[PDB]
Structure formats: C-alpha cells, structure tokens
Amino acid sequence: MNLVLMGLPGAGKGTQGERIVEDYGIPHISTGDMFRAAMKEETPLGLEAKSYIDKGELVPDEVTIGIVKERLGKDDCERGFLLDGFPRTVAQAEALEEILEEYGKPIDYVINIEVDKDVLMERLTGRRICSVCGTTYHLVFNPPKTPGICDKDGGELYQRADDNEETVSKRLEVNMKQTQPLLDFYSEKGYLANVNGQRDIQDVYADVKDLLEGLK
Ligand SMILES: Nc1ncnc2c1ncn2[C@@H]1O[C@H](COP(=O)(O)OP(=O)(O)OP(=O)(O)OP(=O)(O)OP(=O)(O)OC[C@H]2O[C@@H](n3cnc4c(N)ncnc43)[C@H](O)[C@@H]2O)[C@@H](O)[C@H]1O
Ligand SMILES: [Mg+2]
Ligand SMILES: [Zn+2]
Structure with missing residues (x-):
C-alpha cells in the first residue's frame, strides 16, 4: 500500500492521513513535519529549510x-507508506519515480484532496495544533472539547508560525502553480485519484477508504 497525499495548503492531508495510518499501519511521511522537527532540534537541515518554510516558499528540491x-528506505516502509506533502513539484515526482524504482515500490495511488482555494485561508488561520501529538483542530469546524488543549493528551494547542494571512497567501500562491502539472503528471501515470475534500472529515475519509480497500 504505497500512497501519496497531495492538496493545497490546509486541504486536510494531515487530518486524512491520521485515519489512513490508523486503519492500515503504514508510516505517515510528511516532509513538512520532518522539516519542522529538524527546525526544533536545530539540525543543519532544519536551519536551511527554515528560511524557506518561514516565508511560505518551497524548500529546494x-x-x-x-x-x-532516505526515509522511504527504512524497514517500516516494507508494507507500504503514506507520503504527505511530497512530491509538490514535477521534479520531485520524477525523482520519486527513480527512488521507488530502485526500492521496487511503485505508487498505488496519488490521492488529491481537492478543496477550493477560497476556503483555505479560513482553514489555516483557524487551525490549532497539539504541541504534544501534532493532531490538528479548527476553532470552528473541528474544535477541541476544552479550548486550548488536546482531547487526547491534554497538551497545549498552538498556532503554526506560517499559519497567518500573509504566509498562507504565499503558500497558496507557491503551491497553486505546481498543482495542475502534478495532476497532469499522475493523470498520465494512471493512478491519480481525486477526492472531494469539502465535506465532513469522516465522509472525506470514506472516499479514501474505498480506494485503500483494494490494497491489501
Ligand atoms: N516536498 C516539499 N518540497 C519543498 N518544500 C516543502 C515540501 N514539503 C514541505 N515543504 C515546506 O514545508 C512547509 C510546510 O509543509 P506542510 O506542513 O506540508 O504544509 P501544507 O502542505 O501547507 O499543509 P498543512 O499542514 O498546512 O495542511 P494540511 O493539508 O495537512 O491540513 P490539516 O489536516 O492540518 O487541516 C487544516 C485545517 O483544516 C481543518 N480540516 C481538516 N479537514 C477538514 C474538513 N474536511 N472540513 C473542514 N475543516 C477541515 C483542520 O482541523 C485544520 O484546522 C511548506 O510550506 C514548504 O515550505
Ligand atoms: Mg499537515
Ligand atoms: Zn495531542
């Protein structure tokens, strides 16, 4: 079960990815998360990526x-994986082809979580994240039972540094110009799957699960 999750900033990759990994146990591989984890630890990778991430621009290919x-080579990817936020440029997709060809792990589906760009600003500025677990909430669409704290572990919720109007706008601008080519790239490959991301969280996942049940 080799999957790729794509979508514009705030489309819900993390939210949906959380379900997939729960039902299938494949590693959730988010480049955004990996970069931020590096930034927190202050690794050389983190400091280099930081400059781009803080501005809403893509980190170099x-x-x-x-x-x-390196990540897709780990033992835990033996039964499949869930790439989140990668690739997001045609060059990255072409590179992934080579990488997976060497690993003998072809992509089963590239799942595009389609959400109108017009409602993404609201989704991001209203997003709050668990400082302990990474899971996300939304002040309006998916609020925590107790404001400011995670339902699961009681950890404090925060607002990502890049989740403000200006940077969100740049992020939408930057990724929108990469969107259609990626869609065309995988549409040609033959395994692009479009999912309506503008509905209730569990209803979005139902559409995702339909595709996954054919990958055991
Ligand atoms: N491959 C790469 N190459 C180069 N650079 C790279 C790179 N990968 C990463 N980077 C760099 O890293 C940065 C950050 O990357 P990344 O963290 O991957 O940024 P992103 O792509 O913008 O995605 P988000 O995490 O912001 O949103 P999401 O789609 O997961 O949404 P969520 O589920 O939280 O949901 C958002 C909100 O909506 C709510 N929500 C979820 N589902 C629904 C629903 N169905 N209805 C209503 N609300 C919902 C949630 O509760 C939440 O509040 C990039 O900008 C770039 O600088
Ligand atoms: Mg995410
Ligand atoms: Zn939590």
Missing part, C-alpha cells in the same frame, strides 16, 4: 528529495 529517499 535536491535536499528535500534527499531526505525523502
């Missing part, structure tokens, strides 16, 4: 592909 290649 070479270093991004590099850390992904």
Whole structure:
C-alpha cells in the first residue's frame, strides 16, 4: 500500500492521513513535519529549510528529495507508506519515480484532496495544533472539547508560525502553480485519484477508504 497525499495548503492531508495510518499501519511521511522537527532540534537541515518554510516558499528540491529517499528506505516502509506533502513539484515526482524504482515500490495511488482555494485561508488561520501529538483542530469546524488543549493528551494547542494571512497567501500562491502539472503528471501515470475534500472529515475519509480497500 504505497500512497501519496497531495492538496493545497490546509486541504486536510494531515487530518486524512491520521485515519489512513490508523486503519492500515503504514508510516505517515510528511516532509513538512520532518522539516519542522529538524527546525526544533536545530539540525543543519532544519536551519536551511527554515528560511524557506518561514516565508511560505518551497524548500529546494535536491535536499528535500534527499531526505525523502532516505526515509522511504527504512524497514517500516516494507508494507507500504503514506507520503504527505511530497512530491509538490514535477521534479520531485520524477525523482520519486527513480527512488521507488530502485526500492521496487511503485505508487498505488496519488490521492488529491481537492478543496477550493477560497476556503483555505479560513482553514489555516483557524487551525490549532497539539504541541504534544501534532493532531490538528479548527476553532470552528473541528474544535477541541476544552479550548486550548488536546482531547487526547491534554497538551497545549498552538498556532503554526506560517499559519497567518500573509504566509498562507504565499503558500497558496507557491503551491497553486505546481498543482495542475502534478495532476497532469499522475493523470498520465494512471493512478491519480481525486477526492472531494469539502465535506465532513469522516465522509472525506470514506472516499479514501474505498480506494485503500483494494490494497491489501
Ligand atoms: N516536498 C516539499 N518540497 C519543498 N518544500 C516543502 C515540501 N514539503 C514541505 N515543504 C515546506 O514545508 C512547509 C510546510 O509543509 P506542510 O506542513 O506540508 O504544509 P501544507 O502542505 O501547507 O499543509 P498543512 O499542514 O498546512 O495542511 P494540511 O493539508 O495537512 O491540513 P490539516 O489536516 O492540518 O487541516 C487544516 C485545517 O483544516 C481543518 N480540516 C481538516 N479537514 C477538514 C474538513 N474536511 N472540513 C473542514 N475543516 C477541515 C483542520 O482541523 C485544520 O484546522 C511548506 O510550506 C514548504 O515550505
Ligand atoms: Mg499537515
Ligand atoms: Zn495531542
């Protein structure tokens, strides 16, 4: 079960990915999360990626592909994986092809979580994240039972540094110009799957589960 999750900033990759990993146990591989984990620890990778991430721009291809290649090689990817936020440039997709060809692990589906760009600003500025677990909530659409704290572990919720109007706008701008080419790339490959991301969380996942049940 080799999957790729794509979508514009705030479309819900993390939210949906959380379900997939729960029902199938494949590693959730989010480049955004990997970069931020590096930033917190202050690794050389983190400091280099930080400059781009803080501005809402894409981190350069070479270093991004590099850390992904290493990750997909781990033992825990034996039964499949869930790539989140990678690739997000045609170059990255082409590179992933080579990488997976060497690993003998072809992509089963590239799942595009389609959400109108017009409602993504609201989704991001209203997002709050668990400082302990990473799971996300939304002040309006998916609020925590007790404001400011995670339902699961009681950890404090925070607002990502790049989740403000200006940076969100840049993020939408940057990724929108990469969107159609990626869709065309995988549409040609023959395994692009479009999912309506503008509905209730569990209803979005139902559409995702339909595809996954054919991958055991
Ligand atoms: N491959 C790569 N190459 C180069 N650079 C790279 C890179 N990968 C990463 N980077 C760098 O890293 C940065 C950050 O990457 P990344 O963290 O991957 O940024 P992203 O793509 O913008 O995605 P988000 O995490 O912001 O949102 P999401 O789709 O997971 O949404 P969520 O589920 O939280 O949901 C959002 C909100 O909506 C709510 N929500 C979820 N589902 C629904 C629903 N169905 N209805 C209503 N609300 C919902 C949630 O509760 C939440 O509040 C990039 O900008 C770039 O600089
Ligand atoms: Mg995410
Ligand atoms: Zn939590």
